[PDB]
């Protein structure tokens, strides 16, 4: 159900943190996962989901095909959009019930509206132990190298990538603090 990588034009189109990209209705989710079964070697998985929100696609695949007893999980998501209010509520409840799953979420953009419900979704996710962060240069470069058919070309950042990170990280710390 998860793709191995996305097309380079699709990456630059959906993971931009500029205002133009706020019209993008699709939500892309790249993930890395360390699977840590007790007294076994660690195994790794990675892949890509697109929106059933991309979040629900990941959790449905995770729960049905991956989750197993006596196993801890270290999961990182790289998302084009931050989780919508309902999205965030599902993930928050999932994590409350699976303490063996640890989740870090890095997002390219926050939300289309600065609604109270979206803020509370993130706070609630953060409350249940998820780490919520904005994607910076290093995270976009990681995704380019690992989740995109980059064809061996270096990542080329877009104008304003770093300025917009500062603005988003500022907004996010005000939500979470």
Binding residues for Zn(2+): 53, 84, 87
Domain boundaries, the chain: 1-177
110's tokens: 């926050």
- Which of the following is catalytic: 26, 55, 128, 177? 55
Place of tokens 């070697």: 41
90's tokens: 């599902």
132's tokens: 């919520």
Closest C-alpha among 174, 32, 15 to residue 109: 15
- Our answer to whether residue 55 is catalytic in this structure is yes
Q: In terms of DSSP H, where are the helices of the chain?
A: 8-14, 54-61, 85-97, 116-127, 137-147, 161-176
The DSSP 8-state label assigned to residue 92 in this structure reads H
Report the distance separating Cα 151 and Cα 162, nearest Å. Answer: 24
1's tokens: 């159900």
CA atoms within 13 A on the CB side of 23: 2
CA distances in angstroms from 26 to 15, 52, 55, 64, 127, listed in the order given: 11, 11, 12, 24, 26
| β-bridge mates for residue 107, sequence order | 79, 134
Work out the burial of residue 92: count CB atoms within 10 Å of its CB; fewer than 13 is exposed, 13-18 middle, 19 or more buried. buried
CA distances in angstroms from 108 to 14, 42, 73, 139, listed in the order given: 9, 29, 23, 9
Would strands 43-50 and 71-81 be described as parallel, antiparallel, or unpaired?
A: unpaired
Place of tokens 């079964």: 37
Helix (H, G, I), strand (E, B) or coil at 1: coil
Number of separate helices (H) and strands (E) present in the chain: 6, 5
Q: Please, which residues have CB within 8 angstroms of residue 92's CB and are 6 or more apart in sequence?
A: 121, 124, 125, 127, 128, 130
Place of tokens 């690992």: 146
Binding residues: 53, 84, 87
Count CB neighbours of 117 within 10 A: 13
- Residues recorded for the chain: 177
């Amino acid at each position: 159900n998860p793709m191995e990588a996305m097309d380079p034009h699709i990456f630059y189109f959906h993971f931009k943190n500029l205002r133009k990209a706020y019209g993008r209705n699709e939500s892309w989710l790249c993930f890395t996962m360390e699977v840590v079964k007790h007294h076994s070697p660690v195994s790794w998985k990675r892949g890509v989901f697109r929106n059933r929100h991309a979040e629900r696609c990941f959790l449905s695949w995770f729960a049905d095909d991956i989750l197993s007893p006596n196993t801890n999980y270290e999961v990182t998501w790289y998302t084009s959009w931050s989780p919508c209010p309902e999205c965030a509520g599902e993930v928050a409840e999932f994590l409350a019930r699976h303490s063996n799953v640890n989740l870090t979420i890095k997002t390219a953009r926050l939300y289309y509206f600065d609604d109270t419900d979206y803020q509370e979704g993130l706070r609630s996710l953060s409350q249940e132990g998820a780490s919520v962060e904005i994607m910076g240069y290093k995270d976009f470069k990681y995704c380019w190298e690992n989740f995109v058919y980059n064809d061996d070309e270096p990542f080329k950042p877009w104008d304003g990538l770093d300025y917009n990170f500062l603005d988003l990280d500022s907004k996010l710390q005000e939500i979470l603090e």
